Amino acid sequence: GAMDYSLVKALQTAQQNFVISDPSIPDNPIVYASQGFLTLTGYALSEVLGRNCRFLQGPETDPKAVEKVRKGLERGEDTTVVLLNYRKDGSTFWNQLFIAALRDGEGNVVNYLGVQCKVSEDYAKAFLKN
Ligand SMILES: Cc1cc2cc3c(=O)[nH]c(=O)nc-3n(C[C@H](O)[C@H](O)[C@H](O)COP(=O)(O)O)c2cc1C
Ligand SMILES: [Cl-]
């Protein structure tokens, strides 16, 4: 169960920004966060473990983008969205966010994986147009 996912280890090797959540815990909080994610967001590891990643959202984040993540999770569909996120210091960035369920043999979702890619403002407008 623990980081023995090939794909998690692949992601660390590529120095990606990601978190793992555990939905058997109430509110599906973060139980792993990569150094990339911490550097991107300005948070320390002990500021994110045990928190739902919605803390990155703020008043100018689009509730429809968030709604699309929520429904993806409910319907067990992989999702990709571009949404505005906030770092610890309150500065904002556009996050191309990729979320997938990690399932066992029986089809049970044992974790979720989220990978963040920081994108430019121009990238985000173009994306959100289509
Ligand atoms: C593994 C995982 C990673 C992320 C990473 C991010 C992120 O880098 N920025 C962000 O802005 N929201 C995220 N989310 C969404 C958030 O944790 C909530 O799932 C949504 O806000 C919808 O739920 P509700 O707020 O409606 O309850 C995630 C959800 C999961 C499961
Ligand atoms: Cl969630």
Task: Tell me the two tokens of residue 97.
Answer: 């966010």
**Residue count (the chain):** 130
Rounded CA-CA distance 130/24 in Å is: 35
Nearest CA to ligand 1 atom 7: 53
**Ligand 1 pocket, CB under 6 A:** 19, 21, 28, 52-54, 56-57, 66, 69-70, 73, 83, 85, 95, 97, 99, 112-114, 116
Tell me the resolution in Å: 2.0
52 is in an annotated binding site: yes
Nearest CA to ligand 1 atom 4: 114
Task: Tell me the two tokens of residue 44.
Answer: 């320390």
Q: Which amino acid is residue 50, in one-letter code?
A: G
Ramachandran sector of residue 107 (left: φ over 0; alpha: ψ -120 to 50; beta: rest): left
49 is in an annotated binding site: yes
Helices vs. strands in the chain: H and E counts, helices first: 5, 5
Q: Which atom of ligand 1 is nearest to the CA of 57?
A: 11
Instruction: Looking at 58-118, list the stretches that DSSP marks H as alpha helix, in order from N- to C-terminal side.
Output: 63-74
Look up the domain containing 122 and give its range. 1-130
Rounded CA-CA distance 61/96 in Å is: 13
Domain count, the chain: 1
Q: Determine the 3-state secondary structure of 110 from DSSP.
A: strand
**Tell me, what CATH number does 116's domain have?**
3.30.450.20
